[PDB]
Symmetry: C3
Subunit: 298 residues, 3 copies
């Protein structure tokens, strides 16, 4: 009515006409394999519910009007197996990238970041950066019989010959939850560990600016919502005791939105089975702040 919100930006009767394309990845098998609580497969549905409801397109507090932006919802990736789902996701994200549009993928388990990253490495050969905003490092080895999971995505991206580890940042990781062997693996690959305490000392936005300085061009902004403290964000498989505040997350997403080198974003681990109302709202508000930032891109 007299209060236009995100829903209103879905004007693009055709996908190729949209600045931003939302893709859903409703799988949590990766999570279960990594010993996590099931439920993240309901993330895309919960995200969509509040997507229809939240976020003033013209925000007079930040003074950003996102009216001119065109969003499109490409629906969910559908497949018979997780492994087939990954392939279709990678293929889909690539095509959006290839024609210069911005894919935003709502999961679902963090395993989605492997295919998403692969789509990046193909769209921008030898020139990709990646930041993982996560309380965890997610460079865990695969299952004994080779199966991937919510904890392996950045092991398989660091194993990519075309990817420079100097351009990988683990952001807001927590020492109480990250093993020395996994930190060692990241650092040995020249990756950067920006611990939660360091982010908090610098300020989250300032720290993220530093991170983006390291990631450089063609950055994949990968956000695991279990990097947020569970007081603000309880609805995840691995709820954090300490972590980023909702405001820090909003501010970070806004920065990512305005940063022209950020070429795609995913958001993983939203788990409506754990908490179904407050948390999906935070997730949608995070995307909302990204949208506002993106609205300021030249």
């Amino acid at each position: 009515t007299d209060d236009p919100r995100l829903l209103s930006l879905f004007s693009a009767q055709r996908e190729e006409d949209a600045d931003i394309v939302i893709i859903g990845f409703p799988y949590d098998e990766g999570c279960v394999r990594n010993g996590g609580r099931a439920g993240a497969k309901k993330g895309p549905a919960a995200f969509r519910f509040f997507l229809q409801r939240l976020g003033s397109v013209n925000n007079l507090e930040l003074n950003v009007d996102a009216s001119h932006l065109k969003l499109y919802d490409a629906g969910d990736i559908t497949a018979s197996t997780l492994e087939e789902a990954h392939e279709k996701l990678e293929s889909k994200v690539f095509t959006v990238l290839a024609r210069g549009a911005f894919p935003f993928v709502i999961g679902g388990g963090h395993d989605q970041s492997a295919p998403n990253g692969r789509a990046m490495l193909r769209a921008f050969p030898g020139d990709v950066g990646v930041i993982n905003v996560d309380s965890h490092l997610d460079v865990r080895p695969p299952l004994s019989d080779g199966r991937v999971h919510s904890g392996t995505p950045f092991r398989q991206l660091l194993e990519e010959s075309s990817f420079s580890g100097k351009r990988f940042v683990e952001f807001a990781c927590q020492g109480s939850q990250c093993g020395a062997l996994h930190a060692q693996y990241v650092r040995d690959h020249q990756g950067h560990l920006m611990w939660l305490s360091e982010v908090r000392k610098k300020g989250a936005v300032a720290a993220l600016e530093d991170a983006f300085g390291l990631t450089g061009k063609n950055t994949f902004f990968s956000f695991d919502v279990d990097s947020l403290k569970s007081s603000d964000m309880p609805g995840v498989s691995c709820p954090a005791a300490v972590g980023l505040s909702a405001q820090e997350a909003f501010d970070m997403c806004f920065l990512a939105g305005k940063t022209p080198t950020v070429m795609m974003m995913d958001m993983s681990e939203l788990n409506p089975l754990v908490e179904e109302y407050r948390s999906p709202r935070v997730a949608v508000y995070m995307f909302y702040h990204f949208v506002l930032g993106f609205a300021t891109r030249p």
Copy 2:
């Protein structure tokens, strides 16, 4: 026993003998009409439950003894319809005001602020100020067939010929939740928008002091508890992702209590159906801090 609390201040065998009169407004129809989650009609009952239990009358941390104050509970406004409830509420609040006592009204939906404001405009003709502490602006148009709701109260107060909009402050409003047309309406009426980010930058108490400077004499302190972050205050119809902390709310209520130009207060949107224990406790602690501040008035 050896630990006197708020309950003990209810010594006034007669209402006219009390410094502060609590009035309950157990209605949430306004909320439902504004598309909100039902439940706020249980606010007064939940507030009363903890009112019997909380708040040391002599607080050695703040060094304020509220022993001398007399409180009285006038019970709930009872009526057959919301619209009749409003009239009785306005009439009741006026009489408390007219004899120089302080009415505190616990709701219930924020629609109560319309009658409460009217009672103010009558008690202090042409000389009223009003602050709305709210994540939302609440200047929404009425329903298509004229019905009021939890989102219209300040549209109907700004429409009052005796009220100066230069003396209206929307405090801790959130740009992600406030439409440009509603901000426009407030500003066009010379009202003041103090966004959450501005309150946080200044500090909540300092910002509230600034607000009171603008509201001036005969201020109505209207508090929508959905201005608090839902980590602290989950039990409301529209839970906030970001917002005021419990401590900021306590500090603000204490300031309002000590500020002699603050002539009445209401508290709206408490919803025990959403969360029944933590949230009513916060509401009672907010009133408690107001009481302590009031105890320091000359």
Copy 3:
């Protein structure tokens, strides 16, 4: 596997070989007597569940490796009555103390602090300090017929002829929840009240350093988890509206761990019946930070 955590430190096939001994006190009768919500008797079980799961032994964010430490779980104190449970607890804690090891007692209600303190007063005659980290003072009188409870433990320790009250600190107590008569009793005994607002002004670690300066040698670090804000720590009998953050608690426990004069610790009021997942995790992370600090002791 390739990620060793607290569980791995339980190598000591014999108790006397451990640096730190965990003792469980699964009783909440003290709580119920003090008018509290039952459930804290499940604390030790919930604490143990996450003890098996959390806390990287080598923490690269703090740069502390706790690999060298040996922990042992002595199980629960078992008895037919609360009063017999207290005696066995005191006896057990004393023996651990007497041979120079560190007892950590997970409750259970805060009444455990009476026997724990007595074990201290015996192990270090006339030379004990005590800090109570608690939103409440816990110097309440016994029941009319003499029965103790979760609110009396520090009344019975201040009544100890061998204990100097100048070396007792009530840390992070809240004026809204502490009666003037109880504050009076503490101060009259030369005890120190460090209100939450003062702790927050100074910073929690700095304030705790000050407290330890007052407690001196042979300090008993007694932590009531209801000193934490219920946004972070909801699973307690008396949830706090405001209070210490999880991070402040972690930081405080780390300091206690590294402070050589801290000779034992207890943790009380964890109530899985109120909230069963987030809160026990916080409790285990608190112990985890203590362990890390202890790992740095000369």
